[model samples]
Target chain A: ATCKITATPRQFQPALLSTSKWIWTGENPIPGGSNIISTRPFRKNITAPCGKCSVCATIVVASDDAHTFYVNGVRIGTGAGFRQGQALFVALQPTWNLFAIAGQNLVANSPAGIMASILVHFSDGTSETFVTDESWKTLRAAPPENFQLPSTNDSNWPSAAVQGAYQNSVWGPPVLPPVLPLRGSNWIWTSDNVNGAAPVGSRAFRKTVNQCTKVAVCATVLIAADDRYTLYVNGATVGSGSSYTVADAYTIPNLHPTFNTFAINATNGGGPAGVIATILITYSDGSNETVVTDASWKAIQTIPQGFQPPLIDEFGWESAKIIGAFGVAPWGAGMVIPSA
Target chain B: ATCKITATPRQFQPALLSTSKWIWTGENPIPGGSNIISTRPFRKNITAPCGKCSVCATIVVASDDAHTFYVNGVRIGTGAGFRQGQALFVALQPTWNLFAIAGQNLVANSPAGIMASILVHFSDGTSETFVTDESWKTLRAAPPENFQLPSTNDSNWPSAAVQGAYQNSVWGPPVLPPVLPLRGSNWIWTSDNVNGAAPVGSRAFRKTVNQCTKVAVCATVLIAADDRYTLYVNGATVGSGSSYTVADAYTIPNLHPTFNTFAINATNGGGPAGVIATILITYSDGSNETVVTDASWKAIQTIPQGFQPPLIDEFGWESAKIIGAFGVAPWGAGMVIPSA
Candidate 1:
């Protein structure tokens, strides 16, 4: 047999009750300079009540600067400065009167003031109230003699300098140079076979040098078998030779501590592909170091299998370094000194 | 002296009670289909007696094509189909039994085969009997016959061509050729040379035509310009052009329609330092009919001096009549005919 069950009539109970209360701080004084004062009275009221089994209260206050609080004609506490966290507090009574002073003592000045309000919670209910002048007070205490104002202007600031800087307090003889602005195409090769070329299109590598001293420099120029290259610094050539990798630190002795330009010319031979060049520099200060690479080299040949040709390269001295700098100097003014 | 005002406490009233009631009907027997039935029952209790109270009730029914109602075994009426707006009169009956028949003859179907319910509303200053099984007959009705079934089967539907024919009968016309997209830069000219040559840097204004129709079209390209522009269609131009102005119906006809490609070069020799070589277009349907202009043109000068260009120049067409033509036959299809 098929059977179905139906509901039996019974008494119904409504869902749980929920409520919210708003704590408002009426018009109060705006805190001005040291020892601010209230211009108007503070007032607050609980417009609605939440009917819950239990409720919690939260208080909020706003002041121009700092202020003191009073409840029912008794001092409650003092605040540090103008901020949200400083005024929040639980109320001791459901219907407590609130009071506040702008800051400290002041005669007649511009209108500045502070305000405070309270929220109330019961085991099953909640209420709120705003601080009104009818309950709050301003005292006549003298301002602190040591009160000093914070500076109003913020104009002077340090800017990024050319080259780089070294600190004696940091590491061994010297540390790696700060990395320069890098592009995706920059790469460097550590071997003559072109197997050491830095991963192409890598975004994680950087190069930098200390401006306080001079350093030795070497570079690897990527090129095809029959390609040729010319090097220039400040429009003057220091050295030139043939090789797939250009390692010439002896050409330039005292290069600058600032940003200096380096140019190159290259011709490729019939080969598998193009070339990549890496420029490495060590400063005389022993603290300065850098590695530079460019990806804009030209292509030359479509050579057959296994043909490793000799390579040619060049270098030059462009600029010199200045030493002993202090107090926010011009770009590249600080000189790098060798490690002890 | 400061005065204080405190509000006196007042008694709070209890919250208002709100309740809603609805009556729904189940299935009944169809004239030629299988017979089915269902019923529903409801009961309520009065917690507190209330006077000057408000009550409302709604009754709804669904059947397998047809149904009949019986209250206390008394025949009230028969519904041929799913009829709405039917009312049944029931006095202050504390308990009610509603009967719905699955077959044409009530005797053919037993009491267990009836499906129907009753909704009631009453207000009195006295306590009354709480009714049980008030909605019994309604909830037991058979399920409604599914009318939206046949169209859901894809295999049995008409072929695409046949469907298209039917669609054409419902909506008008075939699609028209597409129009060119508007450019964003052009020169502007104003009637009063005060604004001077609106330069190319400002905005470009151009005209386009609907190839299928000889309708004239104008588009305003927004770019940086010195002054302002007066856009012309055909031989007549509209607006002060020295500044921005909206076009009305009368002046729209002179504007050229976009039938084919036409040169949209603008001359900004006059006006306050305006853009050069900018193209703006406005088109008309030959008759004093509809005219259209670009809506994206706006001056990007300093915020205070910037203003939105007119949706249509002073002589452009209004969208009023074109919108009404939508959904109509022939014209309703994706194409519009020129007014001339």
Candidate 2:
């Protein structure tokens, strides 16, 4: 791949060519999936070669006011707007995996815009990205005209012009985030063993994976709590999720060669405020493993947000007691969600 | 024609059959007159035994968020919504004057709707109003379907179910305002005779008419000032307008019998602090008179607000200098706007 990712700002990606102020999330989103952002028209398409060899990339994208991006055609990830940009770790395909976005900006009596920047990290150490320059497309007023689909012949489509550059407005530093580990076995974790009957305020829990490949990053962890929880992996604040029913996945790009710790601050509200989570580590040899919640995990009082990577190994927090394992309880083996 | 005008509130206007939360003006409008409101589909229609005795109706309509009303099926009036429900003096037609509204509300993750309430006042002292209710029609999703035009065959269309009644939520109190007087011959008045080259502070103006009607009302004045002005027909606050460019017409539903006085507190911001105005009143004898901004009007320091109706005969606010006539100036001859 000749694509070289830059952490530099305002170098390649110019501002949106549109004078558009930005778009609003009008309605009919139903969240987490199909949504409407503007009254203005929009069409999208992804780029690149569709590949079979497994590869992963970290994407940082920003849009004028709002945007819903599809990473390799996944249904989960989306971006609202831009101040500092948004991040995503998606599998890269040799084929143009839809990196498409319905960029929107529908402010009345003012300018309109649809600008975005994406820094895609490749396996070759070098990264690739896209900027709001020309070469973009639009929706044909009618059929036989030009379409924005990647498969559509775009030889006649006009190129998009630059509106502004990064930092020129309400944009973020155009730095590329670290690449994500290739997803191997999809696993989820939670405090499936917590009694969590009466409110216990907030609880801390930790799990350690025995080994991971040093050459490449291990798989990501899927997590969700009945109440709320902030996750920490190897002392790095990977991320967190709250809503009982909604699931959130964390990206731990740089993993330890030996063991890695998973720390969580599971806040407890009224009813059973527990958690359920898991980790799926994909090895180079396909010997992937699924780490589920068990009694071996430790519980503590004080919990760290995330495990700071490269430097921090682990923290000796308080020990937690195992309540019960989830089979069919208040929080059953949390539903297996499509988007992590 | 059997549609009796009621002074009642929230009585017969049942809820819109379709469970709706009403609407919000959240997008583009590129309609006939093309327009965009929300992603949720919408179609509307109103039914009536239209007529032509040359009768007019003063309407006060409000939707949850926003609406666009077609008067005479043409470009007449649109609504900004509730608080001061958008006003319209629509001429009653032969067929139902498409009083239908395509209301919109797109609050994320919440219920959507298209509801509205309109108070229609007539010249016969009787008033009629309609609220979003089962009597209204909806856009069908199927064949016998997608009908929006009023001429569409709706014999088989299902009547809308009651969703919410007027005053149920962010709606209105179905109270009818008095019918607006028939306006004729648009004119504008100003103190243009005074030197405006230098920044003159603030100035006030007033007008008195000895020859007026005692049976019905007379002289509906259209007023607009350089910076801003608060108008008074007698002592009550009639109306006001700002930005010399836009004129606001105050309907003198209550006017004087023998003699009447018009008062205005025209403010001076920085530039010229002046006013340009005119009035066209309809007499019971079918004769309408035009009173333009002329030397006949008076200029003063203190000013009144509104008229107590057929009571005050005159005022002594100082004779206002007739500055100049309208052609093409900072304040042009006010358009014969159909509605104020």
Candidate 3:
């Protein structure tokens, strides 16, 4: 793939899509996201310094199209309609180390609408990638103008007018396309206590990792709670779900180097009140350094709803208590979730 | 018009002319990463908030490449890839943030090949990056030495050898050029359940977790045995598997609020055999938590196999009787081991 993107360009179109599909995946992963569609064209690029002309690069790309339509000449894309596209690149040049892309939408003014994905295959049996959403680029339109590159000459672009939504008009939803995965991985879900009457509000848990020497972090995180659950990495929502029983997955292509934070918020439902999930992180070494739901993670009860996530090093939180325990799903809920 | 440097520098490379490109631009992509490739004569400065130039800062950087580099003149950039330089930093500034990167042939190196990356941008649309790698100030043998409004005494210089590689003789392995990636990521092959007759040794899987205070930890570990199984949290490994035609999933990440251990050692294809798969972990509050294969993990089927992940923990191995089944891959006939 060429590059992964992490910006809410099109806009969080709740009208067109369930912004909170899981609490982290769709819109409102963060609160206060102004209902503004970013006009700034979403852009992503990868190094393709041609060593051979027959180099092939394939990437899965889609915008869920909230855009009025492809203006063609313009390189920006954003919308609510999920239109799948393949970015196939071949016979490239050397100096063009970067494979740039732009997409836009007019999802009638939605704020978190823009999204995309791309993967590239190298001549040397190698590959690169690009995926959207996981916060790769906190897309903001250059109010008056935008830079062709990662620069700021202008302030911010006017919010792209949120036109319609994917499933809105036809409100569509969203997949892995072309090219090899940025990194291969495995997802693991767990729980400290799987006994009966799970506690109150949402229990919060997290992993603070110092990945200072790893590279090309390609991770796909999937989680679900009996009641409901949400996930964040350094405060950025990756995805969320309320499968009271089953677990759902999400893909996050952007990650940090220094101290990275991963926190979870899960609450009880009628069934049991625990959570299960996994994150498959692929490093450039083609190896995975993964984290699974385990007893090692400290837990906290409902301290403050607001203090829960998207927040930095804030207090107001406490530690959690593990009552019982259970296994995860290789085999589904019937076996995985004990209390249920 | 390239090289988007962070701090305005006590001064730009004005009197130095070749400022444009090297200052930035050599790197590709819109997310993660920093660029480096020093120019001889490194210089740095700071400006205090009082509009006063009296600011003293410090950064301990070196290439260990034998650059024979220096502070004012002292140095340690490995070899003479390009020494005649300086980290030359000065005064003060803010909007304070950090720059970091991770690159290596292996955390365990053969010596020499060292690198890093950084992104000057952070939230708030504010950026503070200054890619320094091959350039910035290619540290060297204090240069019969070079550059520095400051001074240096010949403290260990000859070592910078001023040898070969990247630009030594038209010599071009590199000098921190843009467009090209540091390392290409290649995912090696691993297994679902190793194939051949597994050795007698009981491979152990474990992770030392120090969870201060997180919320709910959802972890589902999957392990299979040709015989039986046992799981553990702080110490004793209990049971969470059935080996019921399929491998079982175990949840542990949801245990202790303090340290937790995740270790598995099984074998198949022969002697007291067994097999284990992956795990799925979820975190409440949202961020999916999770683990996969052995190579991606720290597995020691046998003590002599010599494995000890980047994980820090202490434990003595004990055999887990498979009140059930067993697992692992068999002995390699010759070469081409699966994913090997």
Candidate 4:
């Protein structure tokens, strides 16, 4: 007979977080339902004291039912029935980095929430930490397209309200993976100022950016909508999302370099909604360009035909309202976003 | 470059079979039906031509819908969605051995039938072959208890009616397993002489046997009813069958050595009826005795209280009418019979 030996090796140095909080879209009870999507955003910009230094970032996240995690618009992974958060190594660029998390409630009348902690280590021996907190923006409806990018303006988004401390009585203590421990984190959700339980109709958001290349191959756009969304790139239909839980990634063979327009029309069926997207372009020279949703994007109440083309005029479009940075409320973490 | 090769090796010698025919209960097509059970019995009494000769017997069986195979009162295996016959090894006793099969038509209006080929190899270099043929008895109703044993009389049962040759237009060639090819096995069912369709009310059959050892331990009885049955051993309730699809096996710690009475009251819901059963008693010397259903069992129109006990008189009981052998009409081969 053969014997099997299983043992848990003690960890000498454990990965840790700094006061990351469990966050959701609303602080008020939303009359228990299933398939509720909540969105949150986390933004971080680093200067890199040593110009060419290497950087490493990791985020550990967990949600009540399911969650999808995205970094700079590209999905890391998805998790479900989360009592323990999954730690993912994030590929961070030197400039601004965007992190997004969408958590969904799978069971009716159950607590809906998500929590995450991120740490970035620099080769110069300097490290920075980010934890889910009230500072994150919470949105009830689908946010503007490219909302996962640093370029997206989220100033109008309401800050998440603190729910409770990490390992609190409400959620009790979460099962922390041996790789990452939540040292300091709190649960946060959408403030009472916003109604996160009902559908808010459709919202249109657009962003036009200028690039050096007129057209390029291998351009990919990653997008996710709350309830439904139709995406257009340079006036051409690219992709769409019927469920926010699914963050679709589409590859575009061509991209106009100058004054390229990216537009989205998202509709919320019920509860919270928002669109978070990222566009990644790689050049022949091995250089890469990343575009993300931010306050710089334009928002309009009415959608017009051929709004995705670069030639479309948007003089009347107002600055898109900011919901949150990433990984806040009305969305939680576990979204099934595909990786680049 | 890597390449993969896939091929089916050819067989040098193929096992052969006699011209086995497909047989059914009725020469006329019974109205199409589902969950219809047809029982057929094949009896082979082989006296080892050479004393002290080792013998090996194997049976290949297949049926429409599903089938349960039994040999010498012990179940072999169950098969469903029959296109290919399964070969099962059988342990044969020196005297008489009974082969029984119960097949059920799963689909309504589908042609229902069963076929089998049996081969016995003796260490003395001689071999004998048995195939499904009109010689087999078919019963729509449950057979008498222990009908599978050689000691039981099956002469009264009507002969099976031949349906057609193997690989008929109605049923294409069956997929034969590599181990055993049905050289000659006909699909056989209950003869049209017997009412193979519609409920014929309840039938009671009983058998009283004599054994060398009285009150022997480790006695297990396996019984199956057409629609329903209640079984008793020596005045004690042993087990019962709710659905003929299920062959129940019961372990009895004690058995009267002499005049052991086995009684079964069976009810037919909408088809032919009969109870086939087997009781195995292991002696202290490590030898085993098997009892099966046969025409020797008595039948009664009315059942009286305390009829299960050995002391109960059956002077007025009539000989049970034989429907057919195991795996005949009213039932096919796929009853879920448990192995001894």
What's the ranking of the predictions by TM-score, best on top?
3, 2, 4, 1
- lDDT tens digits by residue: candidate 3, B246-297: 4443323223322344554343333434434444333322233334433334
Task: Pick the winner on lDDT between candidates 1 and 3.
Answer: 3
The lDDT of each candidate is 0.26, 0.45, 0.34, 0.55
- Per-candidate DockQ values are 0.00, 0.00, 0.01, 0.00
- Ranked by lDDT from best down, the candidates are 4, 2, 3, 1
User: RMSD in angstroms, candidate 3?
Assistant: 31.0
Sort candidate 4 into its docking category: incorrect
| Candidate 2, lDDT over the whole model | 0.45
Residue B150 CA displacement from its true place in model 3, Å: 45
Off by over 4 Å in 3: A1-195, A304-340, B1-340
Interface quality of candidate 1 as DockQ: 0.00
In model 1, what is the error at residue A337, expressed in angstroms? 21
lDDT of 3 at B157: 20
lDDT of 4 at B124: 37
Higher-scoring candidate on lDDT, 2 or 3: 2
lDDT tens readout by residue for model 4, B63-160: 77677776666666788655666755544554445677666666655667777776654433345667777788866555557766657776777766
Task: Write the residue-wise lDDT of candidate 1 on B277-314 in tens digits.
Answer: 22223322212112222322222221221122211221
- lDDT (Cα, 0-100) at B130 in candidate 4: 70
